Amino acid sequence: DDMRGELKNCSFNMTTELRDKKQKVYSLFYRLDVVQINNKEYR
Amino acid sequence: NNNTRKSIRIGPGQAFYATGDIIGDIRQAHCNVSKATWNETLGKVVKQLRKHF
Amino acid sequence: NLWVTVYYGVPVWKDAETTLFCASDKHNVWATHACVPTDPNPQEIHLENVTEEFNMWKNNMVEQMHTDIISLWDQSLKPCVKLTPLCVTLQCTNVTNNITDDMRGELKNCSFNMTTELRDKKQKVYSLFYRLDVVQINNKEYRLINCNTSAITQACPKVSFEPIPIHYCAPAGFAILKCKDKKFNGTGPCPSVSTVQCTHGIKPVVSTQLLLNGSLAEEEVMIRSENITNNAKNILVQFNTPVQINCTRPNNNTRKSIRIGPGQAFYATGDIIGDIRQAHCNVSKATWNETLGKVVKQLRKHFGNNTIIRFANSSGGDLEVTTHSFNCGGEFFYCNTSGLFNSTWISNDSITLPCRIKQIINMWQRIGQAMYAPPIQGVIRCVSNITGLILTRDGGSTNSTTETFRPGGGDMRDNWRSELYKYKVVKIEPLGVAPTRCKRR
Amino acid sequence: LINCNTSAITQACPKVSFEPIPIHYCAPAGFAILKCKDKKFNGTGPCPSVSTV
Amino acid sequence: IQVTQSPSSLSASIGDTITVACEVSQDVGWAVNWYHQRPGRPPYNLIYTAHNLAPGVASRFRGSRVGTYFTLTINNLLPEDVGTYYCQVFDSFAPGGTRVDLR
Amino acid sequence: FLGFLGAAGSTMGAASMTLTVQARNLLSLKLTVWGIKQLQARVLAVERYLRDQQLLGIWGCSGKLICCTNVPWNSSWSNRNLSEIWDNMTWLQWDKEISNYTQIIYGLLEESQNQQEKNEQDLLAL
Amino acid sequence: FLGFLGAAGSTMGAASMTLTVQARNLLSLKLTVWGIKQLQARVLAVERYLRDQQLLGIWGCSGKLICCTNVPWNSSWSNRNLSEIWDNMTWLQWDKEISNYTQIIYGLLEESQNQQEKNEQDLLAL
Amino acid sequence: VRLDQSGTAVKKPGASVRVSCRAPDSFTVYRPRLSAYFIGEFNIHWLRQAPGQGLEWLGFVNIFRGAVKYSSRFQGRITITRDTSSETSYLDLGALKADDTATYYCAWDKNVDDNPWRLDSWGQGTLVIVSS
Ligand SMILES: *[C@@H]1O[C@H](CO)[C@@H](O[C@@H]2O[C@H](CO)[C@@H](O[C@@H]3O[C@H](CO)[C@@H](O)[C@H](O)[C@@H]3O)[C@H](O)[C@H]2NC(C)=O)[C@H](O)[C@H]1NC(C)=O
Ligand SMILES: *[C@@H]1O[C@H](CO)[C@@H](O[C@@H]2O[C@H](CO)[C@@H](O)[C@H](O)[C@H]2NC(C)=O)[C@H](O)[C@H]1NC(C)=O
Ligand SMILES: *[C@@H]1O[C@H](CO)[C@@H](O[C@@H]2O[C@H](CO)[C@@H](O)[C@H](O)[C@H]2NC(C)=O)[C@H](O)[C@H]1NC(C)=O
Ligand SMILES: *[C@@H]1O[C@H](CO)[C@@H](O[C@@H]2O[C@H](CO)[C@@H](O)[C@H](O)[C@H]2NC(C)=O)[C@H](O)[C@H]1NC(C)=O
Ligand SMILES: *[C@@H]1O[C@H](CO)[C@@H](O[C@@H]2O[C@H](CO)[C@@H](O)[C@H](O)[C@H]2NC(C)=O)[C@H](O)[C@H]1NC(C)=O
Ligand SMILES: *[C@@H]1O[C@H](CO)[C@@H](O[C@@H]2O[C@H](CO)[C@@H](O)[C@H](O)[C@H]2NC(C)=O)[C@H](O)[C@H]1NC(C)=O
Ligand SMILES: *[C@@H]1O[C@H](CO)[C@@H](O[C@@H]2O[C@H](CO)[C@@H](O)[C@H](O)[C@H]2NC(C)=O)[C@H](O)[C@H]1NC(C)=O
Ligand SMILES: *[C@@H]1O[C@H](CO)[C@@H](O)[C@H](O)[C@H]1NC(C)=O
Ligand SMILES: *[C@@H]1O[C@H](CO)[C@@H](O)[C@H](O)[C@H]1NC(C)=O
Ligand SMILES: *[C@@H]1O[C@H](CO)[C@@H](O)[C@H](O)[C@H]1NC(C)=O
Ligand SMILES: *[C@@H]1O[C@H](CO)[C@@H](O)[C@H](O)[C@H]1NC(C)=O
Ligand SMILES: *[C@@H]1O[C@H](CO)[C@@H](O)[C@H](O)[C@H]1NC(C)=O
Ligand SMILES: *[C@@H]1O[C@H](CO)[C@@H](O)[C@H](O)[C@H]1NC(C)=O
Ligand SMILES: *[C@@H]1O[C@H](CO)[C@@H](O)[C@H](O)[C@H]1NC(C)=O
Ligand SMILES: *[C@@H]1O[C@H](CO)[C@@H](O)[C@H](O)[C@H]1NC(C)=O
Ligand SMILES: *[C@@H]1O[C@H](CO)[C@@H](O)[C@H](O)[C@H]1NC(C)=O
Ligand SMILES: *[C@@H]1O[C@H](CO)[C@@H](O)[C@H](O)[C@H]1NC(C)=O
Ligand SMILES: *[C@@H]1O[C@H](CO)[C@@H](O)[C@H](O)[C@H]1NC(C)=O
Ligand SMILES: *[C@@H]1O[C@H](CO)[C@@H](O)[C@H](O)[C@H]1NC(C)=O
Ligand SMILES: *[C@@H]1O[C@H](CO)[C@@H](O)[C@H](O)[C@H]1NC(C)=O
Ligand SMILES: *[C@@H]1O[C@H](CO)[C@@H](O)[C@H](O)[C@H]1NC(C)=O
Ligand SMILES: *[C@@H]1O[C@H](CO)[C@@H](O)[C@H](O)[C@H]1NC(C)=O
Ligand SMILES: *[C@@H]1O[C@H](CO)[C@@H](O)[C@H](O)[C@H]1NC(C)=O
Ligand SMILES: *[C@@H]1O[C@H](CO)[C@@H](O)[C@H](O)[C@H]1NC(C)=O
Ligand SMILES: *[C@@H]1O[C@H](CO)[C@@H](O)[C@H](O)[C@H]1NC(C)=O
């Protein structure tokens, strides 16, 4: 109950070894590290 | 939480260490302080603090 | 009776470790300009009656040299363009115009999109990369080899990689003891100690299997090893005579400048004028045979007269160890040297060694950084002396007298032990106390 | 930008002032600075009136 | 180089003091290492340089050098010491080893 | 004349004749590796000289290459004959066989100098 | 023996008896913050020691822990009795009450040393 | 240092075998004066133990640039290589014979001049069985 919304499962486009090639990967960020932008968009 | 460090290569020799999926239940990180010990320490502190007031 | 008398300036020294500053007699990688100008006439003083213990294997000077060389190599690289945008998909095609049999597939004609001076604008350029520099991705798609686990930084083209001799000079209150014994192996006392303010001209040449441009033994070929019984310690060989080595890069290479951003230039490899041949190092067959004969003659002492000595090539590993790698006029070679250590020994002609070229060099094996050597315009050609060997004896059964020796290396410290073998660092202790019949008034 | 094909610019930090502040160059101990007091001194040759600072 | 070590096997009761020999054919200085292998278990370093204890090894283990004659001495033997002993000199391992078991 | 450490292997008397030549060599840019090494070497030389100068000064022997004191020879440090020491030995061995007794000798020299000076104070005052 | 600053609270005479122990402690890598701080500290220590040694040298008292001079003591600085000073006072208060007259004393010391040395030269030449 | 090896392998005579040995986070060292993670000059030794027999030494590889020294009893059919990126060592034995049935161990050598051929840490061992 206390952990509801504290984690965020964020997936983003990230650059890879080959500069032209892009890459999609996901990671977990705590709610205090990401802010909403006005699923939803975060940074 | 039993966190996993997932290495994400964002460039030449540059690695960004991300947070992978957590194995098992996800709980709240917490700290524990003995109630009696903390109460005794607070009692000593308040006893020593009455002198200045 | 007797009384304690204090003396100042007595000739007493203890073994000690200290920082040694540089002195030397275009801008270079070693920053020899920063070295203080050495005296035109070095002072060398003969310490007769003196027998001082020496041990080059536990000498600090080799470690301090290693640290200084790597620090200089790193510092000379900081104000240079970083080729992080080069890690882009490459479209490489076979180069098959005026190429020989041995050169089939060793060079690649890669074309790639590259960032123009205007950030939004992009340009398509092409460059020539050796096969050892590019790896296939699974015409075909390639990438620079180190782009997976290293950031590329181009060596500045204007700094010379040539080894300028450097003298390691100890500060005041310290002395450098030079072992002048001509029959001195690396350990044991050296009863010919002579002090000098600092060492002779040391060229920090970077080679793996053959010791280039080094200092010669005075009388005969010497075989120095920490534990000759230990078949894992490298055997330092020093030649009493020099073995000359021609070699060159026959390709008429052209440096094409590609502007990859604001004030950032990447020097590519343009079309080669004329035919394309194989880089190869020449060694005189008779001279090499004579030197090998002297080496095996001096090597029978540590193993016995009736033993069979056989020289075999490198057993395997990375390219730097399996081949004889070194720099020559700004380019890094990787020479096979399989025809050198090939004969076996029991009780005009030249040997052509096929070499290969690399541009991505990761000397010192540093995690995260690698160097891109810019191509050298014209035909490079250098003449050097093989003044040493790095031999590693194999094991063997107890039923065999055949001791197989193979070229080794990799550890640059072993290369620099062959130049700092005769020197050591001592700390002057000028206070002495001795009983005397004098008593203060 | 005219720079773009010959150089890379770094913006001067706006908070640092380019205004000239007088600064005195002082020699270490064991060294002295000789100040020529001649008002007709053209810069070459002897200076009859020398004062040290 | 040839290295020999003896006896081939020995049985000792709890708490006894036992020693094992490892002879080298040539002077090698102190470059002798001692290894413990429990049955069905990977070997681990026991003594290095013939007189230095490996980390985690109890002080009851002692090694000594007599010219070309090397000895590893066991004090107050305990059940976990059962197994085989090997002495290493560079690339040479003594054949067979010495199996030590409770009596 | 032989030079710096010229008489290192010579006898005691010959070495003592020429202390000055080793005495003079005890003392004689950007933040580059060579520059910082040079600076550290310079400072190290300065401090190595000054430690020795301070030690000489405490014993009341500053400015004198050879200085006699009032500390008796305990004869346990070395009972060797004077002729043997000063004609058939080098400074290196002499320092070799007194490496452990040096500190107590230095302390005796320090205390003897201090008391000597205060004694002088009384006489100069009276 | 008490150690460095051991006799800090002692009387004048007892403190002067052990000047050596405080006298011997005035004198005793990359460009990292710790390294640069170490180098700055080393240079500061060596310069402070040499400033003190030079200041002693000007008064012709180099190498002497306790040295006498030839300038009279004007009672304006301190008129206290000697017995009280040397038996019922510590060096801290003594420096406390003469902090202001130090410079003129140093100047008198320098002038007296120069004049005495010139007189000695005149006598040596004649 | 912890060592991890591959699982059991079953092979026929004349085949080839590859056993992996991974030593995570141990291939790199921090030279302090030089201020970077460099690949240390470690040696990974490869040893095998026949059922009920003593230990036998095969060969070792130098992590720095891949220098290899091989026992003469196996020269010509043995190959030891390491991958600095994955921090793993590979043993490649060829022309396997029925007597090669043994538990193959990979060992860690700090390569310290004062302690020659110290095998400080050992893997769990890998059973390689060959039969027809
Ligand atoms: C061992 O020493 C020899 C002699 O010092 C080195 O050969 C020298 O190599 C350099 C470049 O590698 C040559 O300099 C170049 O000369 C050409 C032609 O004059 C010039 O166009 C270049 O701009 C550059 O100055 C130098 O001439 C050459 N010396 C000779 C041939 O006598 C050799 O490289 C050394 N071995 C090494 C470093 O492994
Ligand atoms: C914090 O944790 C430590 C150890 O995890 C606790 O110490 C233990 O306390 C129990 C009592 O609950 C004893 O039985 C154990 O012997 C103790 N072990 C050690 C190693 O100290 C400590 O009590 C905990 N404190 C709080 C406030 O939770
Ligand atoms: C083999 O190498 C070892 C170690 O380098 C040598 O052992 C040293 O021997 C000297 C002899 O004077 C001792 O003073 C050292 O303490 C030893 N160091 C050790 C044991 O770490 C040994 O002498 C060498 N033997 C041969 C035959 O080369
Ligand atoms: C190395 O030696 C080889 C032969 O031993 C040289 O190759 C010859 O080069 C000349 C040009 O000078 C040609 O005319 C010959 O046909 C070549 N012989 C061959 C290819 O077998 C080579 O030039 C030498 N390299 C040097 C001296 O740098
Ligand atoms: C390396 O190249 C040099 C050229 O600089 C060779 O020296 C020449 O050798 C020939 C013999 O074939 C002589 O006729 C020339 O007079 C030499 N020129 C000199 C000394 O300037 C040298 O022989 C080559 N080394 C090898 C092993 O071939
Ligand atoms: C050392 O020499 C041997 C033989 O002289 C080389 O073995 C050859 O390796 C190549 C691979 O590049 C094979 O294609 C050949 O069939 C092998 N020949 C044999 C086994 O006789 C070995 O590569 C050489 N080592 C180096 C480092 O060059
Ligand atoms: C170093 O040279 C040797 C011989 O000069 C090379 O070994 C030969 O490689 C070719 C390549 O196919 C084989 O056909 C030969 O059978 C091999 N042996 C001989 C005696 O020629 C070796 O490959 C070279 N090392 C390299 C290229 O890295
Ligand atoms: C998602 O998480 C946020 C926490 O910032 C919370 O406010 C929101 O209600 C959550 N939405 C759902 C559907 O769980
Ligand atoms: C986060 O989302 C990814 C898919 O984008 C999924 O694979 C992963 O399991 C998720 N992690 C969670 C829900 O903790
Ligand atoms: C990555 O870019 C694609 C391109 O349209 C987009 O569809 C996708 O949502 C992006 N992924 C993100 C923003 O995580
Ligand atoms: C965390 O997960 C790993 C497997 O990834 C497991 O080995 C470990 O025991 C787990 N830790 C706990 C505290 O359960
Ligand atoms: C703390 O202890 C005092 C006296 O023992 C008691 O009066 C008080 O209620 C206690 N408070 C808590 C929070 O335990
Ligand atoms: C490489 O390819 C380019 C075209 O992308 C061509 O202009 C050039 O001549 C080629 N060079 C060689 C050596 O094949
Ligand atoms: C091009 O070179 C590669 C070497 O990397 C070779 O494998 C390939 O066969 C060559 N292509 C042709 C058409 O010869
Ligand atoms: C450059 O980018 C264009 C854009 O699609 C592509 O068609 C071309 O193949 C690229 N050239 C390379 C990767 O060499
Ligand atoms: C990068 O890719 C190359 C491609 O062959 C591979 O050999 C290398 O091991 C990779 N490095 C990694 C995954 O760190
Ligand atoms: C080296 O020289 C010393 C002294 O002459 C001698 O004792 C020793 O045997 C020589 N060889 C080695 C490998 O130390
Ligand atoms: C190479 O050897 C020649 C003599 O054969 C000599 O004159 C020359 O100085 C040597 N070059 C070096 C040591 O760099
Ligand atoms: C190399 O090519 C250039 C043309 O760019 C020419 O001027 C020069 O003479 C050539 N060098 C040789 C050795 O053929
Ligand atoms: C080198 O000398 C040996 C001496 O036995 C001889 O067998 C061999 O043929 C010689 N090699 C040559 C001259 O190339
Ligand atoms: C090595 O020597 C053998 C004969 O001893 C010869 O057949 C072979 O070609 C040689 N290898 C070379 C020259 O690379
Ligand atoms: C930069 O561009 C200007 C014109 O915009 C030109 O005159 C100048 O030569 C160029 N500099 C280069 C290409 O280095
Ligand atoms: C400055 O004055 C000196 C006076 O001697 C004279 O020699 C010198 O030529 C003058 N210089 C100029 C620039 O007039
Ligand atoms: C070396 O010793 C001999 C006799 O032992 C002596 O005559 C000679 O003077 C000594 N050397 C020096 C430089 O004094
Ligand atoms: C401290 O004061 C007492 C009494 O005044 C005295 O006896 C003692 O000697 C003093 N301490 C020292 C170190 O002199």
CSV table of N, CA and C and ligand atoms in Angstrom, one decimal, chain C residues 26 162-163 203 205 212-213 326-330 380-385, ligand 1:
chain,number,residue,atom,x,y,z
C,26,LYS,N,60.0,20.7,-33.3
C,26,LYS,CA,58.6,20.2,-33.2
C,26,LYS,C,58.3,19.8,-31.8
C,162,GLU,N,58.4,10.1,-32.3
C,162,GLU,CA,59.8,9.7,-32.3
C,162,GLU,C,60.3,9.7,-30.8
C,163,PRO,N,61.1,8.7,-30.5
C,163,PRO,CA,61.7,8.7,-29.1
C,163,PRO,C,62.9,9.6,-29.1
C,203,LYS,N,66.1,6.2,-24.8
C,203,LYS,CA,65.0,6.3,-25.7
C,203,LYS,C,63.9,5.4,-25.4
C,205,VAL,N,61.6,3.6,-26.4
C,205,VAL,CA,61.0,2.9,-27.6
C,205,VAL,C,60.0,1.9,-27.1
C,212,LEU,N,64.3,-2.4,-30.0
C,212,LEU,CA,64.8,-1.5,-31.0
C,212,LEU,C,65.6,-0.3,-30.4
C,213,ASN,N,66.6,0.2,-31.1
C,213,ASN,CA,67.3,1.4,-30.8
C,213,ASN,C,67.9,1.5,-29.4
C,326,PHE,N,55.6,-2.0,-33.0
C,326,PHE,CA,56.4,-0.9,-32.7
C,326,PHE,C,55.9,0.3,-33.6
C,327,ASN,N,56.4,1.5,-33.3
C,327,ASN,CA,56.0,2.7,-34.1
C,327,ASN,C,57.2,3.0,-35.0
C,328,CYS,N,56.9,3.5,-36.2
C,328,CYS,CA,57.9,3.9,-37.2
C,328,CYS,C,57.4,5.1,-38.0
C,329,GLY,N,57.8,6.3,-37.6
C,329,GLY,CA,57.4,7.5,-38.3
C,329,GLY,C,55.9,7.8,-38.1
C,330,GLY,N,55.4,7.5,-36.9
C,330,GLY,CA,54.0,7.9,-36.7
C,330,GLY,C,53.0,6.7,-36.9
C,380,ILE,N,56.6,6.0,-45.7
C,380,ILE,CA,57.4,6.1,-44.5
C,380,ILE,C,58.5,5.0,-44.6
C,381,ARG,N,59.6,5.2,-44.0
C,381,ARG,CA,60.7,4.2,-44.1
C,381,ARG,C,61.7,4.5,-42.9
C,382,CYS,N,62.0,3.5,-42.1
C,382,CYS,CA,62.8,3.7,-40.9
C,382,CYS,C,63.8,2.6,-40.9
C,383,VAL,N,65.0,2.9,-40.4
C,383,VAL,CA,66.1,1.9,-40.2
C,383,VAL,C,66.5,1.9,-38.7
C,384,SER,N,66.5,0.8,-38.1
C,384,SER,CA,66.7,0.6,-36.7
C,384,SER,C,67.7,-0.5,-36.4
C,385,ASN,N,68.0,-0.7,-35.1
C,385,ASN,CA,68.9,-1.8,-34.7
C,385,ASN,C,68.1,-2.7,-33.7
I,1,LIG,C1,65.9,4.2,-34.4
I,1,LIG,O1,66.7,5.3,-34.8
I,1,LIG,C2,66.6,5.7,-36.2
I,1,LIG,C3,67.5,6.8,-36.4
I,1,LIG,O2,67.3,7.9,-35.5
I,1,LIG,C4,65.1,6.1,-36.5
I,1,LIG,O3,65.0,6.3,-37.9
I,1,LIG,C5,64.5,7.7,-38.1
I,1,LIG,O4,63.0,7.6,-38.2
I,1,LIG,C6,62.5,8.9,-38.3
I,1,LIG,C7,61.0,8.7,-38.3
I,1,LIG,O5,60.6,7.4,-38.0
I,1,LIG,C8,63.0,9.6,-39.6
I,1,LIG,O6,62.5,11.0,-39.6
I,1,LIG,C9,61.8,11.2,-40.7
I,1,LIG,O7,62.6,11.4,-41.9
I,1,LIG,C10,61.9,11.6,-43.1
I,1,LIG,C11,62.9,11.6,-44.2
I,1,LIG,O8,63.9,12.5,-43.9
I,1,LIG,C12,61.1,13.0,-42.9
I,1,LIG,O9,60.4,13.2,-44.1
I,1,LIG,C13,60.2,12.9,-41.7
I,1,LIG,O10,59.5,14.2,-41.6
I,1,LIG,C14,60.9,12.5,-40.5
I,1,LIG,O11,61.8,13.6,-40.1
I,1,LIG,C15,64.5,9.6,-39.6
I,1,LIG,O12,65.0,10.1,-40.8
I,1,LIG,C16,65.1,8.2,-39.3
I,1,LIG,N1,66.5,8.3,-39.3
I,1,LIG,C17,67.3,7.6,-40.1
I,1,LIG,C18,66.6,6.8,-41.2
I,1,LIG,O13,68.5,7.6,-40.0
I,1,LIG,C19,64.2,4.9,-36.1
I,1,LIG,O14,62.8,5.3,-36.3
I,1,LIG,C20,64.4,4.5,-34.7
I,1,LIG,N2,63.6,3.3,-34.4
I,1,LIG,C21,62.4,3.3,-33.8
I,1,LIG,C22,61.9,4.7,-33.4
I,1,LIG,O15,61.8,2.3,-33.6
